[PDB]
Amino acid sequence: PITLVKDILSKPPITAHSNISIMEAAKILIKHNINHLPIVDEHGKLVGIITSWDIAKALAQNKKTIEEIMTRNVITAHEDEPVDHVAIKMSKYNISGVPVVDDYRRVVGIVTSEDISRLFGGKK
Amino acid sequence: PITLVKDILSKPPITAHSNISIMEAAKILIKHNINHLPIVDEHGKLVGIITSWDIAKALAQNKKTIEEIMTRNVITAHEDEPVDHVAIKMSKYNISGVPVVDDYRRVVGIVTSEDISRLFGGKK
Ligand SMILES: C[S@@+](CC[C@H](N)C(=O)[O-])C[C@H]1O[C@@H](n2cnc3c(N)ncnc32)[C@H](O)[C@@H]1O
Ligand SMILES: C[S@@+](CC[C@H](N)C(=O)[O-])C[C@H]1O[C@@H](n2cnc3c(N)ncnc32)[C@H](O)[C@@H]1O
Ligand SMILES: CSC[C@H]1O[C@@H](n2cnc3c(N)ncnc32)[C@H](O)[C@@H]1O
Ligand SMILES: CSC[C@H]1O[C@@H](n2cnc3c(N)ncnc32)[C@H](O)[C@@H]1O
Structure with a gap:
């Protein structure tokens, strides 16, 4: 399947x-x-x-x-964004976490490199 | 293939x-x-x-x-260790980076959650 931000994000x-x-x-x-x-x-x-x-x-x-x-200048993600797009983004900007925001910049969660690394490990 | 620590680690x-x-x-x-x-x-x-x-x-x-x-008590990795074993380790201990050591505890590099997250993104 395609894993999305909303499947793995930490909230509240x-x-x-x-x-x-x-x-x-x-x-x-x-x-x-x-x-x-x-x-x-x-x-x-x-x-x-x-x-x-x-x-x-x-x-x-x-x-x-x-x-x-x-x-x-905060790099952000949307809840419907594929997790791999986010991983590429974090690598491109050399950052380790991205707040998840709605269309009006309200924070609804966060995805970090630890969340993506965890995903990598459980996929095996 | 199986990706190993030595393929992705940061050194020196x-x-x-x-x-x-x-x-x-x-x-x-x-x-x-x-x-x-x-x-x-x-x-x-x-x-x-x-x-x-x-x-x-x-x-x-x-x-x-x-x-x-x-x-x-530092959680470590070996250079021949599969990267997914390391990801599971970091998730288990809720940590974000592991020094890579030889059999006598000398530091030869480090693998972080950012390195594994990067790997996740380029695999797509
Ligand atoms: C450019 S990184 C480089 C060091 C290391 N790769 C890291 O992630 O911390 C250091 C800077 O990243 C910034 N940063 C972290 N997350 C960010 C994000 N989502 N958007 C923009 N900058 C962010 C932090 O505020 C910090 O000043
Ligand atoms: C338990 S983590 C929890 C917070 C967050 N998950 C993180 O990684 O920073 C915080 C502690 O992890 C410790 N730590 C980081 N890498 C470690 C490692 N490879 N082995 C043991 N402890 C480590 C740090 O020294 C810090 O005191
Ligand atoms: C910051 S790394 C710690 C872990 O807890 C979660 N986390 C990080 N920052 C926040 C935050 N500001 N609010 C809630 N959870 C967070 C992230 O998903 C990450 O996997
Ligand atoms: C700590 S996150 C910054 C990035 O630079 C590398 N890095 C982290 N710590 C060290 C270190 N102590 N020595 C060399 N490279 C490091 C890691 O592989 C990580 O992807």
């Missing part, structure tokens, strides 16, 4: 607003055992993404805020 | 000793655009692993040293 999505501190973002990553944190506006629409790597960058380069360190 | 491995600071570890992750840092002893043998998530944990929980935060 864990998200945050851009006004939390870097320490607060780190705490969310640890609490939920995740490496990806989509940043959303007051209407729940995607404005950026924070990963563990960005938290490491903040330490390495003396960065101060989430707004300063978040990636604003 | 980027490693560090346990006596570097947390900031210094973060700097290595940023410099090399990676999320995994195998920690090795003076003979190059694996003693632990640091990831971006651990750097985030250090901030979240006021941790002080690499020795304090590194994971010591």
Whole structure:
């Protein structure tokens, strides 16, 4: 069959607003055992993404805020997207996770390289 | 065919000793655009692993040293190991990368979930 994003995505999505501190973002990553944190506006629409790597960058380069360190051009997926299209996308942009969004940029889940790697292993 | 670790692994491995600071570890992750840092002893043998998530944990929980935060029971792979065995391993232990070691625990490379996800996408 063709596996789609909606078959493997993690939900509900864990998200945050851009006004939390870097320490607060780190705490969310640890609490939920995740490496990806989509940043959303007051209407729940995607404005950026924070990963563990960005938290490491903040330490390495003396960065101060989430707004300063978040990636604003976020590569995303749709729930009907074939998982292999997403894998190719992540490889092309050298990234490790993609928020799943609806047509109005609301976050409905996330697919990471760990989810796709898991799929690879259970297919065998 | 059967794809093996040696067909897809990243080398040379980027490693560090346990006596570097947390900031210094973060700097290595940023410099090399990676999320995994195998920690090795003076003979190059694996003693632990640091990831971006651990750097985030250090901030979240006021941790002080690499020795304090590194994971010591490291799940590893061999170069002749089928990539799908590795994917299953990473899923089982909920981890995102595995150092590739020889029979005497010397680090010869690393395979991450991004490498396996890439493999998934190019297979289509
Ligand atoms: C370009 S990657 C390279 C290092 C490694 N391959 C990784 O994925 O972390 C590092 C940057 O990817 C960004 N990133 C992660 N997921 C993203 C996404 N879905 N869209 C855009 N950027 C993303 C992070 O914010 C981080 O600044
Ligand atoms: C259990 S994972 C769960 C969160 C997420 N799945 C991830 O991979 O980061 C978090 C821990 O995995 C540990 N880890 C990463 N790679 C590892 C490996 N090859 N062997 C043992 N532990 C590893 C990291 O040191 C970190 O403390
Ligand atoms: C970030 S890697 C941790 C695993 O948990 C899930 N995950 C990652 N980030 C989030 C998030 N922001 N919200 C919910 N689940 C997530 C992903 O599907 C991944 O396989
Ligand atoms: C950590 S995810 C970044 C990518 O670069 C490679 N990489 C990760 N960690 C290391 C490392 N310690 N040394 C060399 N390459 C690495 C991995 O194969 C991965 O696909």
